Amino acid sequence: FMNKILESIRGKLIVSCQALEDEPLHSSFIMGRMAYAAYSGGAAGIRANTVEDIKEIKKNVSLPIIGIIKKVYNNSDVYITPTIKEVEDLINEGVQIIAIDATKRERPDRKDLKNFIAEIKEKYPNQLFMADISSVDEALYAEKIGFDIVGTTLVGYTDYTKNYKALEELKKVVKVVKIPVIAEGNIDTPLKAKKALEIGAFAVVVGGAITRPQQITKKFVDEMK
Amino acid sequence: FMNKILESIRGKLIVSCQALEDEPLHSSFIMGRMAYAAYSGGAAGIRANTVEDIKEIKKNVSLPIIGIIKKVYNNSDVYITPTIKEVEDLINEGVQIIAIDATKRERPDRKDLKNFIAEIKEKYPNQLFMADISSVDEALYAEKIGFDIVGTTLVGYTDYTKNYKALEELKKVVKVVKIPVIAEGNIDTPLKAKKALEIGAFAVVVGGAITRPQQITKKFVDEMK
Ligand SMILES: [Cl-]
Ligand SMILES: [Cl-]
Ligand SMILES: [Cl-]
Ligand SMILES: [Cl-]
């Protein structure tokens, strides 16, 4: 039953449909239509942020959703579903996969990651949980403390992985981790997405290169000077 | 004054923000936000279809707009601002540039293109008019009958130009036309947009590669099989 969720994304594309408050297309309505567009193009899952976006996305597609809640506390640089409070809001709405910052950095509620995951696995025993990590060490650790999925989402986004390449850290993760590794973070060309599967990713997440038109526009503009 | 409009786009990127009725993001609201995103990414103009989209786009950006009205009559394959009726609706709303199918094909109102343009140039003598053409012959003809701009928009979209390449027909148009030639139609990579300027285009229009996420998604999906 949690197996059926992972077979439905095996070897397929997941499109991240996010637009925070600063961003041009910030609107639950638009993110719902972006999800529909990814579906019409052949995507097999959606990654989505906040409950209002997730709800609207559910009206447009019946694709599986990786759900997160980004909230920035002033204690911590851990902000992807960082505390127990975000987990419950997502459990209440219902998503196929809840993704959580699984780096070694200190959390806003100053709770160990080993306990935190033990508490939600005890509390929500049928819920698929995904680990957003930045290094191979953290990906193996996430595996042993009980995560169902890892993702290379935070590669290059921590001090201790500054300038790490997505694909380069992926082939290190994939060769030592046994649970599904989802390639995610700066997979911004179709060719990189092919290489990610050829490296051994279980699925590939693409965000801005599909759903942030201002960042696609800036690529065109900067090569026209 | 019409000169200031063309200097503001010289050597720059125009982003076409369109989504017809069949399409995932069909909504004037979304097309307004897409225009804002192109602006945030560094675009210098917007191409837009229908008055409700143009109006919403005007709320988001003060970039110059190439305005069209696509309407398909059962008489003709000419559908980009095809009759005098669409021209007036756009004149009433007010756009910096009105773009019109300027191919040699028979129009829905069975009026010659030479007269049609003479009537609107007489009627709207300060309005900048752009010629959407498919071949070099039609681009030179558009120039002599009084158009202000030509665009390679319909290259490959007429029986007599089946399989013509955008860039290949562009360098033929640019070497014999004196008025500004805008490269438009299947300019779907940043590199093609650089080559279009290097060929001699006055400006470059990019559409789906920025503003149709389902067609960007399909490029990723098809290279993941
Ligand atoms: Cl994310
Ligand atoms: Cl991130
Ligand atoms: Cl068009
Ligand atoms: Cl077209």
CSV table of C-alpha atoms and ligand atoms in Angstrom, one decimal:
chain,number,residue,atom,x,y,z
A,1,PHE,CA,0.0,0.0,0.0
A,2,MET,CA,3.0,2.2,0.7
A,3,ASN,CA,4.6,0.0,-2.0
A,4,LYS,CA,2.0,1.0,-4.5
A,5,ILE,CA,2.9,4.7,-4.0
A,6,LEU,CA,6.6,4.0,-4.8
A,7,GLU,CA,5.9,1.9,-7.9
A,8,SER,CA,3.7,4.7,-9.3
A,9,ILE,CA,6.8,7.0,-9.3
A,10,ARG,CA,9.5,4.4,-10.1
A,11,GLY,CA,11.7,5.7,-12.9
A,12,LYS,CA,9.4,8.7,-13.4
A,13,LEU,CA,9.4,12.5,-13.2
A,14,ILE,CA,8.1,14.4,-10.1
A,15,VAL,CA,7.6,18.1,-10.7
A,16,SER,CA,7.9,20.5,-7.7
A,17,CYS,CA,5.2,23.2,-7.9
A,18,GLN,CA,6.3,25.8,-5.4
A,19,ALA,CA,6.2,29.6,-5.3
A,20,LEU,CA,6.9,31.2,-1.9
A,21,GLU,CA,5.7,34.7,-1.0
A,22,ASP,CA,8.4,36.8,-2.7
A,23,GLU,CA,7.9,34.8,-6.0
A,24,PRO,CA,6.0,35.8,-9.2
A,25,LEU,CA,3.4,33.0,-9.2
A,26,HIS,CA,2.7,32.7,-5.5
A,27,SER,CA,-0.9,31.6,-5.4
A,28,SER,CA,-2.5,28.2,-4.6
A,29,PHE,CA,-4.7,28.6,-7.7
A,30,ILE,CA,-1.6,28.8,-10.0
A,31,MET,CA,0.2,26.0,-8.3
A,32,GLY,CA,-2.8,23.8,-8.8
A,33,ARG,CA,-2.7,24.6,-12.5
A,34,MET,CA,1.1,24.1,-12.7
A,35,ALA,CA,0.4,20.6,-11.2
A,36,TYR,CA,-2.2,20.0,-13.9
A,37,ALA,CA,0.4,21.1,-16.6
A,38,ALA,CA,3.0,18.7,-15.2
A,39,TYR,CA,0.5,15.9,-15.4
A,40,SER,CA,-0.5,16.9,-19.0
A,41,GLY,CA,3.2,16.7,-19.9
A,42,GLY,CA,3.6,13.2,-18.5
A,43,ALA,CA,4.8,13.8,-14.9
A,44,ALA,CA,4.0,11.1,-12.3
A,45,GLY,CA,4.1,13.0,-9.1
A,46,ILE,CA,4.0,16.5,-7.5
A,47,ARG,CA,6.1,17.9,-4.7
A,48,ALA,CA,4.3,20.8,-3.0
A,49,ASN,CA,4.6,23.2,-0.1
A,50,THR,CA,2.0,24.4,2.4
A,51,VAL,CA,-1.5,23.0,2.9
A,52,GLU,CA,-3.3,25.6,0.9
A,53,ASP,CA,-1.2,24.7,-2.2
A,54,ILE,CA,-1.6,21.0,-1.5
A,55,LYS,CA,-5.4,21.3,-1.3
A,56,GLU,CA,-5.6,23.2,-4.5
A,57,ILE,CA,-3.3,20.7,-6.2
A,58,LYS,CA,-5.6,17.8,-5.1
A,59,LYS,CA,-8.4,19.5,-7.0
A,60,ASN,CA,-6.4,19.3,-10.3
A,61,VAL,CA,-4.5,16.0,-10.2
A,62,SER,CA,-4.7,12.6,-8.5
A,63,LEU,CA,-1.0,12.2,-8.8
A,64,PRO,CA,0.8,11.3,-5.6
A,65,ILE,CA,2.1,14.3,-3.7
A,66,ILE,CA,5.3,14.8,-1.7
A,67,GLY,CA,4.2,17.3,0.9
A,68,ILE,CA,6.3,19.7,2.8
A,69,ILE,CA,5.8,22.8,4.9
A,70,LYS,CA,8.7,25.3,4.7
A,71,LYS,CA,8.8,27.4,7.9
A,72,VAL,CA,11.8,29.4,9.0
A,73,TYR,CA,12.4,29.7,12.7
A,74,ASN,CA,15.0,32.1,14.0
A,75,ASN,CA,16.8,29.2,15.9
A,76,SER,CA,17.8,27.0,13.0
A,77,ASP,CA,18.6,26.8,9.3
A,78,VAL,CA,16.4,23.6,9.3
A,79,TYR,CA,13.2,24.8,7.7
A,80,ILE,CA,11.8,22.0,5.5
A,81,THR,CA,9.0,20.5,7.7
A,82,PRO,CA,11.3,21.2,10.7
A,83,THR,CA,9.2,20.5,13.8
A,84,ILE,CA,6.4,18.1,14.8
A,85,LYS,CA,3.9,20.9,14.2
A,86,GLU,CA,4.4,20.9,10.4
A,87,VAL,CA,4.2,17.1,10.3
A,88,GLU,CA,0.7,17.2,11.9
A,89,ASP,CA,-0.7,19.9,9.6
A,90,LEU,CA,0.4,17.6,6.7
A,91,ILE,CA,-0.9,14.5,8.3
A,92,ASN,CA,-4.3,16.3,8.8
A,93,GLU,CA,-4.5,17.2,5.1
A,94,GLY,CA,-3.1,13.8,4.0
A,95,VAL,CA,-0.2,13.4,1.6
A,96,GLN,CA,1.3,10.3,0.1
A,97,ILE,CA,4.9,11.4,1.2
A,98,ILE,CA,5.9,13.8,3.9
A,99,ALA,CA,9.4,15.2,3.3
A,100,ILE,CA,11.6,16.6,6.1
A,101,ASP,CA,15.0,18.2,6.5
A,102,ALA,CA,17.1,15.3,7.6
A,103,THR,CA,20.5,17.1,7.8
A,104,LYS,CA,22.6,17.0,11.0
A,105,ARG,CA,21.9,20.6,11.7
A,106,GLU,CA,20.3,21.7,15.0
A,107,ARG,CA,16.5,21.9,14.7
A,108,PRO,CA,14.3,24.8,15.8
A,109,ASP,CA,12.8,22.7,18.7
A,110,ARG,CA,16.3,21.5,19.7
A,111,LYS,CA,15.2,17.8,19.4
A,112,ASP,CA,17.4,15.1,18.0
A,113,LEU,CA,16.6,13.8,14.5
A,114,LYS,CA,16.8,10.2,15.8
A,115,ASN,CA,14.0,10.8,18.3
A,116,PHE,CA,11.9,13.1,16.1
A,117,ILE,CA,11.6,10.4,13.4
A,118,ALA,CA,11.0,7.7,16.0
A,119,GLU,CA,8.1,9.8,17.4
A,120,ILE,CA,6.3,10.2,14.0
A,121,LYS,CA,7.0,6.7,12.9
A,122,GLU,CA,5.4,5.5,16.2
A,123,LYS,CA,2.6,8.1,15.8
A,124,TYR,CA,1.9,7.8,12.1
A,125,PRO,CA,2.9,4.2,11.4
A,126,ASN,CA,1.5,3.9,7.9
A,127,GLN,CA,2.9,7.3,6.6
A,128,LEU,CA,5.7,7.3,4.1
A,129,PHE,CA,8.5,9.7,5.2
A,130,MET,CA,11.2,11.1,2.9
A,131,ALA,CA,14.6,12.4,4.1
A,132,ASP,CA,15.9,15.6,2.5
A,133,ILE,CA,19.7,15.3,3.0
A,134,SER,CA,22.8,17.1,1.9
A,135,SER,CA,25.6,14.5,2.1
A,136,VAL,CA,26.1,10.7,1.8
A,137,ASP,CA,26.7,10.4,5.5
A,138,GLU,CA,23.3,12.0,6.3
A,139,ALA,CA,21.6,9.7,3.7
A,140,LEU,CA,23.0,6.6,5.3
A,141,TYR,CA,22.0,7.9,8.7
A,142,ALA,CA,18.5,8.7,7.5
A,143,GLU,CA,18.3,5.1,6.3
A,144,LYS,CA,19.3,3.5,9.6
A,145,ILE,CA,17.1,5.7,11.7
A,146,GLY,CA,14.1,4.6,9.7
A,147,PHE,CA,13.3,6.8,6.7
A,148,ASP,CA,11.5,5.3,3.7
A,149,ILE,CA,13.0,7.5,1.0
A,150,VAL,CA,16.0,9.8,0.8
A,151,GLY,CA,16.4,12.8,-1.6
A,152,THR,CA,19.4,14.8,-2.6
A,153,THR,CA,17.4,18.0,-2.0
A,154,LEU,CA,19.8,19.9,0.2
A,155,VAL,CA,23.0,19.0,-1.6
A,156,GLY,CA,25.0,22.2,-1.8
A,157,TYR,CA,22.7,24.0,0.7
A,158,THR,CA,24.7,23.4,3.8
A,159,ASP,CA,28.0,24.8,4.9
A,160,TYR,CA,29.6,21.4,4.9
A,161,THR,CA,28.5,20.7,1.2
A,162,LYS,CA,29.2,24.1,-0.4
A,163,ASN,CA,29.6,23.6,-4.1
A,164,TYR,CA,28.7,19.9,-4.1
A,165,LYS,CA,27.2,18.9,-7.5
A,166,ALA,CA,23.8,17.2,-7.5
A,167,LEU,CA,24.7,14.3,-9.8
A,168,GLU,CA,28.2,13.9,-8.2
A,169,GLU,CA,26.8,13.4,-4.7
A,170,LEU,CA,24.0,11.3,-6.2
A,171,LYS,CA,26.2,8.5,-7.5
A,172,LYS,CA,27.9,8.4,-4.1
A,173,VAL,CA,24.5,8.1,-2.3
A,174,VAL,CA,23.1,5.6,-4.7
A,175,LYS,CA,25.9,3.1,-4.3
A,176,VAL,CA,25.7,2.7,-0.5
A,177,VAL,CA,22.0,3.3,0.2
A,178,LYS,CA,19.4,0.6,-0.3
A,179,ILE,CA,16.1,2.4,0.2
A,180,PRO,CA,14.9,4.5,-2.8
A,181,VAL,CA,17.1,7.6,-3.5
A,182,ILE,CA,15.2,10.4,-5.3
A,183,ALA,CA,17.4,12.8,-7.3
A,184,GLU,CA,16.3,16.4,-6.4
A,185,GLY,CA,17.8,19.8,-6.4
A,186,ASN,CA,19.1,21.6,-9.5
A,187,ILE,CA,18.0,18.9,-11.9
A,188,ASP,CA,17.4,21.6,-14.4
A,189,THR,CA,17.9,20.0,-17.9
A,190,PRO,CA,16.3,17.0,-19.5
A,191,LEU,CA,19.8,15.5,-20.0
A,192,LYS,CA,20.6,15.8,-16.3
A,193,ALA,CA,17.4,14.0,-15.6
A,194,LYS,CA,18.3,11.2,-17.9
A,195,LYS,CA,21.8,11.0,-16.2
A,196,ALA,CA,20.2,10.9,-12.8
A,197,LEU,CA,18.2,7.7,-13.7
A,198,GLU,CA,21.3,6.3,-15.4
A,199,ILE,CA,23.2,6.9,-12.2
A,200,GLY,CA,20.5,4.9,-10.3
A,201,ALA,CA,18.0,7.3,-8.9
A,202,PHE,CA,14.6,5.8,-8.1
A,203,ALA,CA,12.9,9.0,-9.4
A,204,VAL,CA,13.8,12.5,-10.4
A,205,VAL,CA,12.3,15.8,-9.0
A,206,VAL,CA,12.5,18.9,-11.3
A,207,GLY,CA,11.4,22.3,-10.0
A,208,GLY,CA,12.3,25.7,-11.3
A,209,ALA,CA,13.3,24.5,-14.8
A,210,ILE,CA,9.6,23.7,-15.2
A,211,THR,CA,7.7,25.9,-12.7
A,212,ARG,CA,9.7,29.1,-12.1
A,213,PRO,CA,9.3,31.1,-15.4
A,214,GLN,CA,11.4,34.0,-14.1
A,215,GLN,CA,14.3,31.7,-13.6
A,216,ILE,CA,13.9,30.2,-17.1
A,217,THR,CA,13.6,33.7,-18.4
A,218,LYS,CA,16.8,34.7,-16.7
A,219,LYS,CA,18.7,31.9,-18.5
A,220,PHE,CA,17.5,33.2,-21.9
A,221,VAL,CA,18.3,36.9,-20.9
A,222,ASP,CA,21.8,36.1,-19.7
A,223,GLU,CA,22.8,34.3,-22.9
A,224,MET,CA,21.5,37.2,-25.0
A,225,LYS,CA,24.1,39.7,-23.7
B,1,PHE,CA,7.3,57.9,-30.2
B,2,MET,CA,6.9,54.7,-32.1
B,3,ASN,CA,10.7,54.8,-32.2
B,4,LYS,CA,10.9,54.8,-28.4
B,5,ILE,CA,8.8,51.5,-28.4
B,6,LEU,CA,11.3,49.8,-30.7
B,7,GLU,CA,14.4,51.0,-28.8
B,8,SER,CA,13.0,49.6,-25.6
B,9,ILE,CA,13.0,46.1,-27.2
B,10,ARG,CA,16.2,46.4,-29.4
B,11,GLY,CA,18.4,43.4,-28.8
B,12,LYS,CA,16.1,42.2,-25.9
B,13,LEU,CA,13.8,39.3,-25.0
B,14,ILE,CA,10.1,39.3,-25.5
B,15,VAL,CA,8.1,36.6,-23.7
B,16,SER,CA,4.9,35.3,-25.2
B,17,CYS,CA,2.4,34.7,-22.4
B,18,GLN,CA,-0.4,32.7,-24.0
B,19,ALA,CA,-2.7,29.8,-23.0
B,20,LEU,CA,-5.7,29.1,-25.2
B,21,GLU,CA,-8.8,27.3,-23.9
B,22,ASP,CA,-7.6,23.7,-24.2
B,23,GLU,CA,-4.3,24.6,-22.2
B,24,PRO,CA,-3.4,24.0,-18.6
B,25,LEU,CA,-2.9,27.6,-17.5
B,26,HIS,CA,-5.7,29.2,-19.5
B,27,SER,CA,-6.6,32.2,-17.2
B,28,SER,CA,-6.1,35.9,-17.6
B,29,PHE,CA,-4.9,36.0,-13.9
B,30,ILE,CA,-2.1,33.4,-14.6
B,31,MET,CA,-1.0,35.1,-17.8
B,32,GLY,CA,-0.7,38.4,-15.8
B,33,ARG,CA,1.6,36.6,-13.3
B,34,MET,CA,3.5,35.0,-16.1
B,35,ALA,CA,4.2,38.4,-17.6
B,36,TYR,CA,5.4,39.6,-14.2
B,37,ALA,CA,7.7,36.6,-14.0
B,38,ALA,CA,9.2,37.3,-17.4
B,39,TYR,CA,9.8,40.9,-16.2
B,40,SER,CA,11.4,39.7,-13.0
B,41,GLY,CA,13.7,37.5,-15.1
B,42,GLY,CA,14.8,40.4,-17.3
B,43,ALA,CA,12.4,40.3,-20.3
B,44,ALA,CA,11.7,43.6,-22.1
B,45,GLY,CA,8.4,43.0,-23.7
B,46,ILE,CA,5.3,40.7,-23.7
B,47,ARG,CA,3.4,39.1,-26.5
B,48,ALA,CA,-0.2,38.4,-25.5
B,49,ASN,CA,-3.5,37.1,-26.9
B,50,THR,CA,-7.1,38.4,-26.3
B,51,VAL,CA,-8.2,41.5,-24.5
B,52,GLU,CA,-8.9,39.9,-21.2
B,53,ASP,CA,-5.3,38.6,-21.0
B,54,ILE,CA,-3.8,41.9,-22.2
B,55,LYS,CA,-5.8,43.9,-19.6
B,56,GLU,CA,-4.6,41.6,-16.7
B,57,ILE,CA,-1.0,41.8,-18.1
B,58,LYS,CA,-1.2,45.6,-18.0
B,59,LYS,CA,-2.0,45.4,-14.2
B,60,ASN,CA,1.3,43.5,-13.6
B,61,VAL,CA,3.9,45.0,-15.9
B,62,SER,CA,4.5,48.3,-17.8
B,63,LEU,CA,6.5,46.5,-20.4
B,64,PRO,CA,5.5,47.1,-24.1
B,65,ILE,CA,2.9,44.5,-25.3
B,66,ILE,CA,2.6,42.9,-28.8
B,67,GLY,CA,-1.1,42.3,-28.9
B,68,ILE,CA,-2.9,39.8,-31.0
B,69,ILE,CA,-6.4,38.2,-31.1
B,70,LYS,CA,-6.4,34.6,-32.4
B,71,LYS,CA,-9.8,33.8,-33.8
B,72,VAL,CA,-10.4,30.8,-36.1
B,73,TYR,CA,-13.0,31.3,-38.9
B,74,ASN,CA,-14.2,28.4,-40.9
B,75,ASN,CA,-13.2,30.2,-44.1
B,76,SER,CA,-9.5,30.5,-43.6
B,77,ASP,CA,-6.3,29.3,-41.9
B,78,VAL,CA,-5.5,32.9,-41.3
B,79,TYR,CA,-6.4,33.3,-37.6
B,80,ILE,CA,-3.8,35.7,-36.0
B,81,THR,CA,-5.7,39.0,-35.8
B,82,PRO,CA,-7.3,38.1,-39.1
B,83,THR,CA,-10.0,40.6,-39.8
B,84,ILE,CA,-10.6,44.3,-39.2
B,85,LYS,CA,-12.8,43.3,-36.2
B,86,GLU,CA,-9.9,42.0,-34.1
B,87,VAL,CA,-7.8,45.1,-34.9
B,88,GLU,CA,-10.4,47.4,-33.5
B,89,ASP,CA,-10.8,45.4,-30.3
B,90,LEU,CA,-7.1,45.7,-29.8
B,91,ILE,CA,-7.0,49.4,-30.8
B,92,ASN,CA,-9.8,50.0,-28.2
B,93,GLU,CA,-7.8,48.3,-25.4
B,94,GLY,CA,-4.5,49.9,-26.6
B,95,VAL,CA,-1.3,48.0,-27.3
B,96,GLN,CA,2.1,49.1,-28.3
B,97,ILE,CA,2.2,46.7,-31.2
B,98,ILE,CA,-0.6,44.9,-33.0
B,99,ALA,CA,0.5,41.7,-34.8
B,100,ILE,CA,-1.4,40.3,-37.7
B,101,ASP,CA,-1.1,37.2,-39.9
B,102,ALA,CA,0.6,38.6,-43.0
B,103,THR,CA,0.9,35.4,-45.1
B,104,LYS,CA,-0.4,35.2,-48.6
B,105,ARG,CA,-3.3,32.9,-47.6
B,106,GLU,CA,-6.9,33.8,-48.2
B,107,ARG,CA,-8.4,35.8,-45.3
B,108,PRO,CA,-11.7,35.0,-43.6
B,109,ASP,CA,-13.3,38.2,-44.9
B,110,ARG,CA,-11.8,37.6,-48.4
B,111,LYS,CA,-10.1,41.0,-48.4
B,112,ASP,CA,-6.6,41.5,-50.0
B,113,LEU,CA,-3.8,42.0,-47.5
B,114,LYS,CA,-2.6,45.0,-49.4
B,115,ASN,CA,-5.9,46.8,-48.9
B,116,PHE,CA,-6.4,45.6,-45.3
B,117,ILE,CA,-3.1,47.1,-44.1
B,118,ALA,CA,-3.8,50.3,-46.1
B,119,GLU,CA,-7.1,50.6,-44.3
B,120,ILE,CA,-5.7,50.3,-40.8
B,121,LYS,CA,-2.7,52.5,-41.6
B,122,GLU,CA,-5.1,55.2,-42.8
B,123,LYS,CA,-7.4,54.6,-39.9
B,124,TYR,CA,-4.8,54.2,-37.1
B,125,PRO,CA,-1.9,56.2,-38.4
B,126,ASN,CA,0.2,56.2,-35.2
B,127,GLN,CA,-0.2,52.5,-34.4
B,128,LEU,CA,2.8,50.2,-34.8
B,129,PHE,CA,1.8,47.1,-36.8
B,130,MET,CA,3.8,43.9,-37.0
B,131,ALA,CA,3.7,41.3,-39.8
B,132,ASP,CA,3.6,37.6,-38.8
B,133,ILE,CA,5.0,35.9,-42.0
B,134,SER,CA,6.1,32.4,-43.0
B,135,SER,CA,8.6,33.0,-45.9
B,136,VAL,CA,11.1,35.6,-47.0
B,137,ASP,CA,8.9,36.5,-50.0
B,138,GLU,CA,6.0,37.4,-47.6
B,139,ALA,CA,8.4,39.3,-45.3
B,140,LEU,CA,9.6,41.5,-48.2
B,141,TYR,CA,6.0,42.0,-49.3
B,142,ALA,CA,4.9,43.0,-45.8
B,143,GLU,CA,7.7,45.6,-45.9
B,144,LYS,CA,6.6,47.2,-49.2
B,145,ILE,CA,2.9,47.3,-48.3
B,146,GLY,CA,3.8,49.3,-45.2
B,147,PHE,CA,4.3,47.1,-42.1
B,148,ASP,CA,6.6,48.5,-39.3
B,149,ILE,CA,7.9,45.1,-38.1
B,150,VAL,CA,8.1,41.6,-39.4
B,151,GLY,CA,8.2,38.4,-37.3
B,152,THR,CA,9.2,34.8,-38.4
B,153,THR,CA,6.2,33.6,-36.3
B,154,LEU,CA,4.5,31.5,-39.0
B,155,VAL,CA,7.7,29.8,-40.4
B,156,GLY,CA,6.9,26.2,-40.8
B,157,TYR,CA,3.1,26.8,-40.2
B,158,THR,CA,2.0,27.0,-43.8
B,159,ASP,CA,1.9,24.3,-46.5
B,160,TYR,CA,4.5,26.2,-48.5
B,161,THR,CA,7.0,26.3,-45.6
B,162,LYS,CA,6.6,22.8,-44.2
B,163,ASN,CA,9.7,21.9,-42.2
B,164,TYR,CA,11.4,25.3,-42.5
B,165,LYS,CA,13.7,26.0,-39.6
B,166,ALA,CA,13.2,29.2,-37.6
B,167,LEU,CA,16.9,30.2,-37.7
B,168,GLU,CA,17.4,29.1,-41.3
B,169,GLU,CA,14.6,31.3,-42.6
B,170,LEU,CA,15.6,34.1,-40.3
B,171,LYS,CA,19.0,34.6,-41.9
B,172,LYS,CA,17.3,34.8,-45.2
B,173,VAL,CA,14.8,37.3,-44.1
B,174,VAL,CA,17.3,39.5,-42.2
B,175,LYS,CA,19.7,39.9,-45.2
B,176,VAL,CA,17.0,41.4,-47.5
B,177,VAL,CA,14.6,43.2,-45.1
B,178,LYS,CA,15.4,46.7,-43.7
B,179,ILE,CA,12.6,47.2,-41.1
B,180,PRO,CA,13.1,45.3,-37.8
B,181,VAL,CA,12.8,41.5,-38.1
B,182,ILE,CA,11.8,39.9,-34.8
B,183,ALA,CA,12.8,36.2,-34.4
B,184,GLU,CA,9.8,34.3,-33.2
B,185,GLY,CA,8.5,30.7,-33.4
B,186,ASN,CA,10.2,27.7,-31.8
B,187,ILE,CA,13.0,29.8,-30.2
B,188,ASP,CA,13.1,27.3,-27.4
B,189,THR,CA,16.6,27.3,-26.0
B,190,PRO,CA,18.8,30.2,-24.7
B,191,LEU,CA,21.4,29.2,-27.3
B,192,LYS,CA,19.0,29.6,-30.2
B,193,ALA,CA,18.1,33.0,-28.8
B,194,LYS,CA,21.7,34.0,-28.8
B,195,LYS,CA,22.1,32.7,-32.4
B,196,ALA,CA,19.0,34.7,-33.4
B,197,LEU,CA,20.6,38.0,-32.3
B,198,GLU,CA,23.9,36.9,-33.8
B,199,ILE,CA,22.1,36.3,-37.1
B,200,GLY,CA,20.7,39.9,-37.0
B,201,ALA,CA,17.3,39.7,-35.4
B,202,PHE,CA,16.1,43.0,-33.9
B,203,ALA,CA,14.6,41.2,-30.9
B,204,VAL,CA,13.6,37.6,-30.0
B,205,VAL,CA,10.3,36.2,-28.8
B,206,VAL,CA,10.2,33.0,-26.6
B,207,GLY,CA,6.9,31.4,-25.8
B,208,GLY,CA,6.4,27.8,-24.7
B,209,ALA,CA,9.9,27.2,-23.4
B,210,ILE,CA,9.2,29.8,-20.7
B,211,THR,CA,5.4,29.8,-20.3
B,212,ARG,CA,4.0,26.3,-21.3
B,213,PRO,CA,5.1,24.1,-18.4
B,214,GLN,CA,3.4,21.1,-19.9
B,215,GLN,CA,5.6,21.4,-22.9
B,216,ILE,CA,8.7,21.8,-20.8
B,217,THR,CA,7.6,18.8,-18.8
B,218,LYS,CA,7.2,16.7,-21.9
B,219,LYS,CA,10.8,17.4,-22.9
B,220,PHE,CA,12.0,16.0,-19.5
B,221,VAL,CA,9.7,13.0,-19.7
B,222,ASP,CA,10.7,12.0,-23.2
B,223,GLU,CA,14.4,12.0,-22.4
B,224,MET,CA,13.7,9.8,-19.3
B,225,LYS,CA,12.5,6.8,-21.3
C,1,CL,CL,11.9,21.8,-1.6
C,2,CL,CL,15.6,24.0,-1.1
C,3,CL,CL,1.4,33.8,-31.6
C,4,CL,CL,1.4,30.1,-34.0
